[PDB]
Amino acid sequence: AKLGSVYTEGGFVEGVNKKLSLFGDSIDIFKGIPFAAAPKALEKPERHPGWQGTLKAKSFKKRCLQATLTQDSTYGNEDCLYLNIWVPQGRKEVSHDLPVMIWIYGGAFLMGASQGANFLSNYLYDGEEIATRGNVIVVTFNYRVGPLGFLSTGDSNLPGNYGLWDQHMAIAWVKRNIEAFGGDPDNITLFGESAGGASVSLQTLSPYNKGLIKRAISQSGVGLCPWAIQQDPLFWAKRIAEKVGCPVDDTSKMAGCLKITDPRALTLAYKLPLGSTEYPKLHYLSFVPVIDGDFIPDDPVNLYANAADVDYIAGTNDMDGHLFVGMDVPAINSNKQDVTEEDFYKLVSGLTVTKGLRGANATYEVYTEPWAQDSSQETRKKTMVDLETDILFLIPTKIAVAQHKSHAKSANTYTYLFSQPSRMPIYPKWMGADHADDLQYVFGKPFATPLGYRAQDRTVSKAMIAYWTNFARTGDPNTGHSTVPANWDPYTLEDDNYLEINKQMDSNSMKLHLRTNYLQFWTQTYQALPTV
Numbered sequence: 001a002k003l004g005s006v007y008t009e010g011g012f013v014e015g016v017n018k019k020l021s022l023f024g025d026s027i028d029i030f031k032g033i034p035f036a037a038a039p040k041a042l043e044k045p046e047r048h049p050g051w052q053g054t055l056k057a058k059s060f061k062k063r064c065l066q067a068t069l070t071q072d073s074t075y076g077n078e079d080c081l082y083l084n085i086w087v088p089q090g091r092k093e094v095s096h097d098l099p100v101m102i103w104i105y106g107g108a109f110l111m112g113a114s115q116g117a118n119f120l121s122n123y124l125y126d127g128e129e130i131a132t133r134g135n136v137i138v139v140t141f142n143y144r145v146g147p148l149g150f151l152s153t154g155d156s157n158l159p160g161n162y163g164l165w166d167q168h169m170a171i172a173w174v175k176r177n178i179e180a181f182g183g184d185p186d187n188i189t190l191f192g193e194s195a196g197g198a199s200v201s202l203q204t205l206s207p208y209n210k211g212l213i214k215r216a217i218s219q220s221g222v223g224l225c226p227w228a229i230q231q232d233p234l235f236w237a238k239r240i241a242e243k244v245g246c247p248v249d250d251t252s253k254m255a256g257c258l259k260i261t262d263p264r265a266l267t268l269a270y271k272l273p274l275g276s277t278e279y280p281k282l283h284y285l286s287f288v289p290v291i292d293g294d295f296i297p298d299d300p301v302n303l304y305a306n307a308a309d310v311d312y313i314a315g316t317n318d319m320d321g322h323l324f325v326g327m328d329v330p331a332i333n334s335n336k337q338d339v340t341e342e343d344f345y346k347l348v349s350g351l352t353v354t355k356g357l358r359g360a361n362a363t364y365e366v367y368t369e370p371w372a373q374d375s376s377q378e379t380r381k382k383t384m385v386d387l388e389t390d391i392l393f394l395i396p397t398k399i400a401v402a403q404h405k406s407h408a409k410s411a412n413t414y415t416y417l418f419s420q421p422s423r424m425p426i427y428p429k430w431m432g433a434d435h436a437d438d439l440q441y442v443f444g445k446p447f448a449t450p451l452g453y454r455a456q457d458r459t460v461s462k463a464m465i466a467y468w469t470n471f472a473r474t475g476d477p478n479t480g481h482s483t484v485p486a487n488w489d490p491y492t493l494e495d496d497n498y499l500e501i502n503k504q505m506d507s508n509s510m511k512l513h514l515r516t517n518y519l520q521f522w523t524q525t526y527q528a529l530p531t532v
């Protein structure tokens with residue numbers, strides 16, 4: 001089957017077709033379809049005007065303007081609002097009424113390309129593997145990151161959340177123009193890790209995506225995360241301003257100015273440290289979503305009515321915050337150096353700032369219940385990893401799923417926990433599933449690039465890819481185009497049952513009550529403490 005030229009709302013598009021099997025199994029590949037007209041700096045997206053005759057969709061366009069390794073904004077260009085579609089094809093004839101799985105990349109909201117990092121055409125987010133096995137259409141798309149993506153003054157002079165709008169624009173395009181590619185319009189599945197996970201959440205919660213999303217999958221990130229919303233945006237708008245020589249004495253004046261400023265300078269004005277800083281790095285992420293009067297109307301925790309009829313899944317990697325706490329504290333040297341009570345306290349202090357010393361010493365105690373002297377440092381270093389994992393991903397997620405469940409009209413909820421430890425020979429032996437370790441497995445990387453992967457890896461990859469895809473089709477992580485090695489039971493507030501995910505996927509896999517106690521300390525105790 002060869003879809004050849006497809007008829008979008010903008011005109012005919014034409015992409016390759018790749019020979020897979022001999023019994024006619026193929027894969028139509030479309031790279032670079034524009035979903036929106038090149039955006040006006042610090043302005044909402046506008047539909048694409050359309051083209052002349054036929055668009056040669058054969059290559060990944062350029063990512064949105066972003067900083068390289070903060071030394072130069074040497075990446076991407078203001079023009080980047082495109083999407084890449086993967087349609088698996090059948091010998092007898094072209095695919096029809098298939099499920100659709102859109103993917104939202106993540107990079108602290110300040111980084112990212114729809115193609116995903118690569119090495120000699122080995123694109124981290126190549127939706128071929130996931131599409132083939134699943135027999136589902138993979139859609140990856142670009143969106144504005146960095147200041148240009150979410151710069152805000154707090155009020156109508158420059159609301160922010162442009163990046164999200166872009167995301168919403170893609171979805172809207174995939175809703176309208178997917179049937180022509182053979183997809184099922186009324187079966188759109190949003191899925192993404194980190195900022196993407198937070199984005200997945202935000203999109204479902206946003207009243208703008210009313211009837212566009214059918215399924216949703218957040219991973220290592222949810223809207224309720226601390227890093228997922230900017231509480232004081234105007235504090236940072238003023239900063240960029242002073243750097244780009246704009247008037248900081250009035251929002252209207254600022255805005256008018258910023259929109260006129262050279263995007264490269266607007267981008268390179270902000271630089272995340274990544275070095276000895278007084279405060280834990282969470283405090284430096286500045287440009288991320290915010291609450292506005294329309295997209296994200298209220299606090300995400302209050303918007304969950306909207307995702308009521310949106311099947312949902314959310315999970316976390318057991319040691320998700322390891323990455324981060326690494327830079328915050330060089331714990332990882334489970335060799336020479338050793339962390340102390342003071343080093344742990346300081347950490348807790350910096351991570352509790354909102355509630356002050358009251359919340360600080362309280363939290364310290366609750367995380368210091370168990371013990372292990374300097375001789376048994378391992379428990380300490382692990383605890384820090386646990387501290388970060390809790391506030392950064394676990395707890396927010398835990399309240400997200402729980403929250404969804406309570407509000408679900410008719411929508412299955414599920415939660416997981418990627419336990420498959422990292423290969424990273426650098427980290428201490430006690431290392432579990434770090435942040436982003438889930439990615440490769442979800443993308444069939446173990447099958448696309450076998451050498452450098454072993455059975456287990458192909459097993460986890462196959463499992464996850466088995467689940468996501470079944471989910472995308474029916475909503476049940478067990479039902480669809482593939483068989484599941486272990487049954488994924490729908491989440492219940494009572495049991496707080498989660499599917500642990502790793503090599504051994506049998507029956508004991510679905511566990512219950514993952515740190516319900518800390519869910520309690522944060523949701524009930526620490527929360528009651530006064531804001532300082």
Ligand SMILES: C[C@@H](CCC(=O)NCCS(=O)(=O)O)[C@H]1CC[C@H]2[C@H]3C(C[C@H](O)[C@]12C)[C@@]1(C)CC[C@H](O)C[C@@H]1C[C@H]3O
Pocket residue numbers: 116117118119122123124125445449451452
């Ligand atoms: C061919 C390898 C590259 C390193 C090389 O072989 N050097 C060894 C001898 S020497 O050093 O050259 O002296 C391969 C084997 C497995 C590979 C990796 C890899 C980059 C690359 O192709 C690697 C690391 C990557 C993370 C690259 C990004 C990608 O999207 C994921 C991918 C996973 C995996 O396939």
Ligand SMILES: C[C@@H](CCC(=O)NCCS(=O)(=O)O)[C@H]1CC[C@H]2[C@H]3C(C[C@H](O)[C@]12C)[C@@]1(C)CC[C@H](O)C[C@@H]1C[C@H]3O
Pocket residue numbers: 224225226282299301349350351352353354355390391392395396399522523527
């Ligand atoms: C990470 C937890 C604690 C906050 C965190 O430690 N922030 C660290 C930065 S700081 O140094 O304190 O500033 C989070 C995770 C998800 C959170 C909760 C939460 C309080 C809180 O921030 C929690 C429990 C709250 C009921 C707080 C009020 C809010 O509008 C609803 C919200 C639900 C959810 O976000």
Ligand SMILES: *[C@@H]1O[C@H](CO)[C@@H](O)[C@H](O)[C@H]1NC(C)=O
Pocket residue numbers: 345357361364
């Ligand atoms: C501060 O933390 C210590 C433990 O490090 C605790 O004993 C104390 O009660 C806490 N509060 C104050 C005000 O010191």
